Nucleic acid binder design. Structure first.
Ligand SMILES: [Ca+2]
Ligand SMILES: [K+]
Ligand SMILES: [K+]
Ligand SMILES: [K+]
Length: 133
RNA sequence: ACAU
DNA sequence: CGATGT
């Protein structure tokens, strides 16, 4: 319905898909950049969006924050809910780094708890997510 | 078809 | 136009 302004928004950016992947998280209200991941040489859009959400969960938990997370990614929201990133990206030396991060993100989800609502940013109604690149 |  | 996903 309406934007929950007291929230964290995440977004992925890439050069190619697959290609160089980065992500960041911002304060939805203020646009302040709260975290930014160093570019990962090869990944997919959906792996990046998944890592961004899980990073947000870890960031908020560390700070004892109950704010929700917005993502515009139907895919990544489901992967987090399932605790399983069903990526099609081949596993090889080129993709080892992103797959390590994805494996570790799944492992974190399987060993920690959180109440953080993970909410769909409604781009069609609200425009671009505030974490946009 | 929808979300990127 | 190409790719990643449910
Ligand atoms: Ca974006
Ligand atoms: K996005
Ligand atoms: K983006
Ligand atoms: K498609």
């Amino acid at each position: 319905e309406e934007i929950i302004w007291e929230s964290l928004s995440v977004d992925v950016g890439s050069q190619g898909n697959p290609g160089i992947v980065e992500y960041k998280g911002v304060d939805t209200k203020t646009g302040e950049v709260l975290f930014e991941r160093e570019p990962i040489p090869i990944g997919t859009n959906n792996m990046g969006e998944f890592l961004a959400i899980v990073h947000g969960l870890r960031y908020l938990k560390e700070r004892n924050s109950r704010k929700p997370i917005y993502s515009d990614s139907q895919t990544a929201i489901k992967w987090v809910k399932d605790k399983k990133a069903k990526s099609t990206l081949v596993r090889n030396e080129e993709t080892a780094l992103i797959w390590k991060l994805v494996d570790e993100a799944e492992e974190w989800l399987n060993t920690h708890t959180y109440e953080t609502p993970i909410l769909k940013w409604q781009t069609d109604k609200w425009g671009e997510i505030k974490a946009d690149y």
